[PDB]
């Protein structure tokens, strides 16, 4: 009864860390290998600020051959984590596409979203923070840098998205 359910969706490219970020959040261990996820849904009960929250999370597939049914995954979720790798310029350029697909399927200029720059444990980043900052400023959403291996800002990213939903 005093528990709220948040349906979260993680979208992005193929090799960014949609699964590593989610798996690090749930089981607190980073998957060094790479098994591309088709579709996965997880649930976790956490305490954000004051309330107890049940979080339904959807790990979509970045590959467009399986992202043909992307309208279905978007049509149900109430919040979206848009993930790019800071060593993948293409994944960052593809964020524009996803936001349009989200803003289309939900028919709104304001949707609870958070821009996440993943793989911030590496050096020689092809995408600077200031770039990803300006994009999030254009969308009106916050930007948080994460590292699934380091667990840096991984909690901050997800919890900020829930706050973005809860503060809608």
């Amino acid at each position: 009864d005093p528990m709220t359910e948040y349906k979260l969706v993680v979208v992005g490219a193929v090799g960014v860390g949609k699964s590593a970020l989610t798996i690090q959040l749930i089981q607190n261990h980073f998957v060094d290998e790479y098994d591309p996820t088709i579709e996965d849904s997880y649930r976790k009960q956490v305490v954000i600020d004051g309330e107890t929250c049940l979080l339904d999370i959807l790990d979509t597939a970045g590959q467009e051959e399986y992202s043909a049914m992307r309208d279905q995954y978007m049509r149900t979720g109430e919040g979206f984590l848009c993930v790019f790798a800071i060593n993948n310029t293409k994944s960052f350029e593809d964020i524009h596409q996803y936001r349009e697909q989200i803003k289309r399927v939900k028919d709104s200029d304001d949707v609870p979203m958070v821009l996440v720059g993943n793989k911030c444990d590496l050096a020689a980043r092809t995408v600077e923070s200031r770039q990803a900052q300006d994009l999030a400023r254009s969308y009106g959403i916050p930007y948080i840098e994460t590292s699934a291996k380091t667990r840096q800002g991984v909690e901050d990213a997800f919890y900020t998205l829930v706050r973005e939903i809860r503060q809608h």
Binding site: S19, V31, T37, I38, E39, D40, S41, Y42, R43, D56
Partner: protein, 63 residues
């Protein structure tokens, strides 16, 4: 092709096609489940069953 399956706590997962335990091995460990403590399903089948047999039909899994 592809076959979707349900998990506890209103969770689920889809995997492609072999041994049903070998096809769902990585995802079970990903989702947090040992294949000995659980088995497929409202009618249970064997773990060594061919995965490509139940293509198109969706199953459930509990401990």
């Amino acid at each position: 092709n592809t076959i979707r399956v349900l998990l506890p706590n209103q969770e689920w997962t889809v995997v492609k096609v072999m041994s049903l335990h070998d096809s769902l091995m990585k995802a079970l460990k990903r989702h947090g489940l040992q294949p000995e403590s659980s088995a497929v399903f409202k009618a249970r089948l064997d773990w060594n069953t061919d995965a490509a047999s139940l293509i198109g039909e969706e199953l459930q899994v509990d401990f």
